Coordinates of C-alpha atoms in Angstrom, one line a residue:
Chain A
X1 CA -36.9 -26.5 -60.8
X2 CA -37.5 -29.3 -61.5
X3 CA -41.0 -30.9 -61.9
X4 CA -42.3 -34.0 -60.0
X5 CA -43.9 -37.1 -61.5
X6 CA -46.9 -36.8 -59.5
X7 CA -49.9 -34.7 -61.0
Chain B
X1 CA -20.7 -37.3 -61.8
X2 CA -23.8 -37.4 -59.8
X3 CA -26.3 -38.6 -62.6
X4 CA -24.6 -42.0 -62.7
X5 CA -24.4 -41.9 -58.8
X6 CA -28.5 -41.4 -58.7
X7 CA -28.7 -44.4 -61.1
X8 CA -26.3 -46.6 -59.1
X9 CA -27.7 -45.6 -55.6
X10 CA -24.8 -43.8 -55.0
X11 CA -25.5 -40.2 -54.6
X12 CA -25.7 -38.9 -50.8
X13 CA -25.4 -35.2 -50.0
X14 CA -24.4 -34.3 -46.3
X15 CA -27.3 -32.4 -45.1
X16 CA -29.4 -30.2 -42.0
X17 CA -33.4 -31.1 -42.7
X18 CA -35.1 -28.0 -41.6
X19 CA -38.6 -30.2 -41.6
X20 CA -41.6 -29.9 -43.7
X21 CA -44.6 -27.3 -43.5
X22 CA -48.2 -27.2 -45.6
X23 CA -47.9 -25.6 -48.4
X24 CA -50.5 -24.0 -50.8
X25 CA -49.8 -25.2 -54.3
X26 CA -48.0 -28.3 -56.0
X27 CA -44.9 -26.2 -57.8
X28 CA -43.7 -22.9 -57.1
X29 CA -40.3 -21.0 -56.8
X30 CA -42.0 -18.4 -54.1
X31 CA -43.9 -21.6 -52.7
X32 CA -40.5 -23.2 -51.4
X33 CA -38.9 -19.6 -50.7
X34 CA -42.2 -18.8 -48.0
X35 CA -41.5 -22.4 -46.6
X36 CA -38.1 -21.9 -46.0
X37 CA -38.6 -18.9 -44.3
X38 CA -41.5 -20.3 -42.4
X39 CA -39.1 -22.6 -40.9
X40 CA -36.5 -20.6 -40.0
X41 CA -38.4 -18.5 -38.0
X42 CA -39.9 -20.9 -35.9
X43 CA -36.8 -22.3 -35.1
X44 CA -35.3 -18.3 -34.7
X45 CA -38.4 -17.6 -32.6
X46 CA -37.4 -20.0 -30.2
X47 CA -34.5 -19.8 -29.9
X48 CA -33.1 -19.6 -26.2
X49 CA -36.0 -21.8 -24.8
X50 CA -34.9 -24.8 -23.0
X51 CA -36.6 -27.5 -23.9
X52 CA -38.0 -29.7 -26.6
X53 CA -39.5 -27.5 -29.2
X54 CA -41.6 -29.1 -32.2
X55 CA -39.4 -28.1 -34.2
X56 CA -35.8 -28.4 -34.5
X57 CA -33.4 -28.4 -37.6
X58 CA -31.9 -31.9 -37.4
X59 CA -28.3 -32.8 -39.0
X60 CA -28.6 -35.6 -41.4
X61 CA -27.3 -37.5 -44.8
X62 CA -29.4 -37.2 -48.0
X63 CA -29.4 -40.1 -50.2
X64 CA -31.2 -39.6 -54.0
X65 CA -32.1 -42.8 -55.8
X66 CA -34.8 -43.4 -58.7
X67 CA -37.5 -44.8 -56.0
X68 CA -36.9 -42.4 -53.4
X69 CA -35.6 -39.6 -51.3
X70 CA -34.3 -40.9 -48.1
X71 CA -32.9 -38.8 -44.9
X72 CA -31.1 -40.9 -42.3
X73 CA -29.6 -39.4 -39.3
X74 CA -26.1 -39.2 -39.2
X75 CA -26.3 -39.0 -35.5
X76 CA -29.0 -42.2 -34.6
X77 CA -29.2 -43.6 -38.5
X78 CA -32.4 -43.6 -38.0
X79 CA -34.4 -43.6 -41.4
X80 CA -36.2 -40.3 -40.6
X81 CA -37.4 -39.8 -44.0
X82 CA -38.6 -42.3 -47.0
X83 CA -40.1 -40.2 -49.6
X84 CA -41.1 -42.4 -52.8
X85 CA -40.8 -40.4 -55.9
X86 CA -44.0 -41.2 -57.6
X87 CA -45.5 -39.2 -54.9
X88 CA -43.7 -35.7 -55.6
X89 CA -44.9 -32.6 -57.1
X90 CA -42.0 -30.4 -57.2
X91 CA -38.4 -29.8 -55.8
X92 CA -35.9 -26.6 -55.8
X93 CA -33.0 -24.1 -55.0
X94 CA -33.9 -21.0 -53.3
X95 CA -33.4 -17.5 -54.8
X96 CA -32.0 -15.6 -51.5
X97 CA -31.0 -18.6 -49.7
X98 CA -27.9 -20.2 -51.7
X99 CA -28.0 -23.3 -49.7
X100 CA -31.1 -24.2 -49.3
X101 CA -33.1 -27.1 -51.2
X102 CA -36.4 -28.5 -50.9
X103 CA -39.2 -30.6 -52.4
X104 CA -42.9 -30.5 -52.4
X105 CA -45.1 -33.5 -52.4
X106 CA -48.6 -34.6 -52.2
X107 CA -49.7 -36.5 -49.1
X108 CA -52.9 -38.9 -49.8
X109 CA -54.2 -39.5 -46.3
X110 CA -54.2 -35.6 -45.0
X111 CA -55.0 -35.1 -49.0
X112 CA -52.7 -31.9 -48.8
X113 CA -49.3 -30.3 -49.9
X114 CA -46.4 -30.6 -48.9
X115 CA -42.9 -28.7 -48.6
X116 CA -39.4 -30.5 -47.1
X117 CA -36.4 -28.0 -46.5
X118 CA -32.9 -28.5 -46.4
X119 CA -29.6 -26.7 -46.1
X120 CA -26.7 -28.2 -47.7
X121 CA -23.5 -28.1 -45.8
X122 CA -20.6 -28.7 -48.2
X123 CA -22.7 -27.9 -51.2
X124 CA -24.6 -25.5 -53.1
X125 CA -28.6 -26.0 -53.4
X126 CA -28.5 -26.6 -56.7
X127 CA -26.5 -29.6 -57.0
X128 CA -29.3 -31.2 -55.0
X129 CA -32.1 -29.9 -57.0
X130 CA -30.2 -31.4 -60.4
X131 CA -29.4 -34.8 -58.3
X132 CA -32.9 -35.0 -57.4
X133 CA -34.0 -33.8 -61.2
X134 CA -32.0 -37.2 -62.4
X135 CA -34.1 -38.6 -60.4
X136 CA -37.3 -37.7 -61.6
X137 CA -36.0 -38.0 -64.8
X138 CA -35.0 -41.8 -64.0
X139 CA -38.6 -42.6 -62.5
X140 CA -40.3 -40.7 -65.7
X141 CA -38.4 -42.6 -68.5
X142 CA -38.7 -46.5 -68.1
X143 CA -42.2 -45.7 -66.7

């Protein structure tokens, strides 16, 4: 973790 | 602590960038873990040559801001690495490997994924993960 702002 | 240093522009972690290798998918605990190892055994496999090899681990400072991700060399200061954040997938701690962190991140031009190892020297890998959580949090929210 964590998640990315891109997608 | 290190929230309001991401904020401020504050927040640097003393760091080795291992260097980045294709990876297959955007997120992925086993997706950073295979790049990790990946790296350290190209640089393992050659160990003993003499020469300039593609690939060797370079020591560096990691700074972690709301726009970006940014490795200068300690040794030349050169900015080596200038990662916007609006451009990254996916970042992480490493189950068998305590102190290493990386990231994954899309790359528009080669249209492909892409992982970026570290190993912390003074800290643990999750510190950076959580600094560099703040600041995907950061971009996220005003946006």
């Amino acid at each position: 973790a964590y998640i990315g702002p891109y997608l | 602590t290190d929230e309001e240093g991401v904020r401020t522009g504050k927040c640097s972690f003393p760091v080795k960038y291992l260097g980045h290798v294709e990876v297959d998918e955007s997120r992925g605990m086993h997706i950073c873990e295979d790049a990790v190892k990946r790296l350290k055994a190209e640089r393992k496999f050659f160990k003993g040559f003499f020469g300039k090899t593609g690939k060797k681990a370079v020591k560096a400072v990691l700074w972690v801001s709301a726009d970006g991700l940014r490795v200068v060399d300690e040794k030349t200061k050169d900015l080596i690495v200038d990662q916007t954040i609006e451009k990254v997938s996916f970042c992480a701690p490493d189950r068998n490997f305590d102190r290493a962190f990386s990231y994954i991140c899309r790359d528009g031009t080669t249209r492909r994924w892409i992982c970026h190892c570290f190993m912390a020297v003074k800290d643990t890998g999750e510190r950076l993960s959580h600094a560099v959580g703040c600041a995907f949090a950061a971009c996220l929210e005003r946006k």
